[PDB]
Enzyme design. Sequence first.
Site, PDB file in Angstrom:
ATOM      1  N   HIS A   1       0.835  -1.198   0.000  1.00 32.11           N
ATOM      2  CA  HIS A   1       0.000   0.000   0.000  1.00 32.11           C
ATOM      3  C   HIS A   1       0.871   1.251   0.000  1.00 32.11           C
ATOM      4  CE1 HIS A   1      -3.368   2.661   1.177  1.00 32.11           C
ATOM      5  NE2 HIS A   1      -2.314   3.383   1.558  1.00 32.11           N
ATOM      6  N   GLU A   2       1.800   1.268   0.946  1.00 35.31           N
ATOM      7  CA  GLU A   2       2.637   2.387   1.137  1.00 35.31           C
ATOM      8  C   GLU A   2       3.706   2.408   0.042  1.00 35.31           C
ATOM      9  OE1 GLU A   2       1.954   4.941   2.768  1.00 35.31           O
ATOM     10  OE2 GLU A   2       0.307   4.235   4.050  1.00 35.31           O
TER      11      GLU A   2
ATOM     12  N   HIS B   1       1.758   3.589  -3.141  1.00 36.34           N
ATOM     13  CA  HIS B   1       1.678   5.032  -3.118  1.00 36.34           C
ATOM     14  C   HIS B   1       2.764   5.634  -4.018  1.00 36.34           C
ATOM     15  CE1 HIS B   1      -1.762   5.466  -0.665  1.00 36.34           C
ATOM     16  NE2 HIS B   1      -1.240   4.913   0.412  1.00 36.34           N
TER      17      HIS B   1
ATOM     18  N   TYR C   1      -3.214  13.977  -3.283  1.00 34.19           N
ATOM     19  CA  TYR C   1      -3.650  13.314  -2.056  1.00 34.19           C
ATOM     20  C   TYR C   1      -4.718  14.170  -1.361  1.00 34.19           C
ATOM     21  CZ  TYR C   1      -1.704   9.069   0.314  1.00 34.19           C
ATOM     22  OH  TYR C   1      -1.431   7.808   0.751  1.00 34.19           O
TER      23      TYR C   1
ATOM     24  N   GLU D   1      -5.029   5.963  -2.583  1.00 33.13           N
ATOM     25  CA  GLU D   1      -5.153   4.970  -1.499  1.00 33.13           C
ATOM     26  C   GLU D   1      -5.834   3.693  -2.011  1.00 33.13           C
ATOM     27  OE1 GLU D   1      -4.481   5.085   2.109  1.00 33.13           O
ATOM     28  OE2 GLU D   1      -3.105   6.715   1.621  1.00 33.13           O
TER      29      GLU D   1
ATOM     30  N   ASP E   1      -9.682  14.723   6.679  1.00 35.62           N
ATOM     31  CA  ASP E   1      -9.025  13.532   6.058  1.00 35.62           C
ATOM     32  C   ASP E   1      -8.487  13.907   4.661  1.00 35.62           C
ATOM     33  OD1 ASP E   1      -8.183  10.745   5.991  1.00 35.62           O
ATOM     34  OD2 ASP E   1     -10.078  10.160   5.062  1.00 35.62           O
TER      35      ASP E   1
ATOM     36  N   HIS F   1      -8.698   8.479   3.102  1.00 37.30           N
ATOM     37  CA  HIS F   1      -8.648   7.188   3.789  1.00 37.30           C
ATOM     38  C   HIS F   1     -10.061   6.673   4.072  1.00 37.30           C
ATOM     39  CE1 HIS F   1      -4.405   8.141   4.138  1.00 37.30           C
ATOM     40  NE2 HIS F   1      -4.213   6.854   4.461  1.00 37.30           N
TER      41      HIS F   1
HETATM   42 ZN   LIG Z   1      -1.630   5.553   2.619  1.00 37.33          ZN
END
Ligand SMILES: [Zn+2]
EC number: 3.4.24.27
Length: 316
Positions: free
Chosen positions: A142-143, A146, A157, A166, A226, A231
């Site tokens: 996931h990261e 990104h 983002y 995301e 957020d 997210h």
């Molecule tokens: Zn993230």
Amino acid sequence: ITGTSTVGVGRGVLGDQKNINTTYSTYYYLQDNTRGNGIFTYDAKYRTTLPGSLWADADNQFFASYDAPAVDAHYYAGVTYDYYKNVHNRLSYDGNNAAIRSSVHYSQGYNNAFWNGSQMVYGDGDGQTFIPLSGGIDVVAHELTHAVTDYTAGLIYQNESGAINEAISDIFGTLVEFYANKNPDWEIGEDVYTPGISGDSLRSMSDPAKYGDPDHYSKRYTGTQDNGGVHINSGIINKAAYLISQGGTHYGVSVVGIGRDKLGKIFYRALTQYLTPTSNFSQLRAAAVQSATDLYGSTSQEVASVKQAFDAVGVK
Ligand SMILES: [Zn+2]
Ligand SMILES: [Ca+2]
Ligand SMILES: [Ca+2]
Ligand SMILES: [Ca+2]
Ligand SMILES: [Ca+2]
């Protein structure tokens, strides 16, 4: 480091044993000299100065309960790298064997982990809300995903686009968990989200609403927080992306599943060859529909399923 590639061995957050690739020179540093321009890992030292100091071991065996994050936050990167290569034919995040650096023990009980832009980062969790976020492979990709999304699309983002970044990072974050076939679920971080309650997760893709995530573009969160709800509203795209692989009758809309290894190539192509910073959901639709056409012509079930799967979660 200039040094000699070997193999050592160490223990995950969730204590699995796993051969790792490490670089001897004096010590054994956690430099996988095997994939890309290297995949490095640095001890942050429970502090914030990045990337920390490159990880080193004396005996080349990482079983100490301080190494569990480094190692898990290492094996898992090379499995991800493996994926993006051994499917999508992509060479590290950049596309040109960039060096995947990683820092673990980034600050005291930091209940999170991110792509800082340069590098993946990882906490140790507070120990109530998380355990080392190296611990989940879900979490690593996931990261890392990104970063892909940086050096492909650059989806900004916040608002819809952000909800997409995301989502992708959820989407290939799953498709990577299924690569390794390591207790593979359409869920986000169960393995290292709340030890005190096995059988839960931070997010879901099959049913997001269980963890306050919308599964339709009628329930799309607006407010400034957020960063517009990255997210959160992701959950829409999680469902979309998920529905396609698997199928189902969401709010009365008979979708038809195509497996996870036909979801990949589609989101990836779209990710890489169709999306922009300024890509709302609706365009994600166009982009997934189009991809399908390229990848399987128009009159295929693929184009038809994507149309269905976005037709479910309220996106036109
Ligand atoms: Zn993230
Ligand atoms: Ca040791
Ligand atoms: Ca799992
Ligand atoms: Ca998972
Ligand atoms: Ca749990």
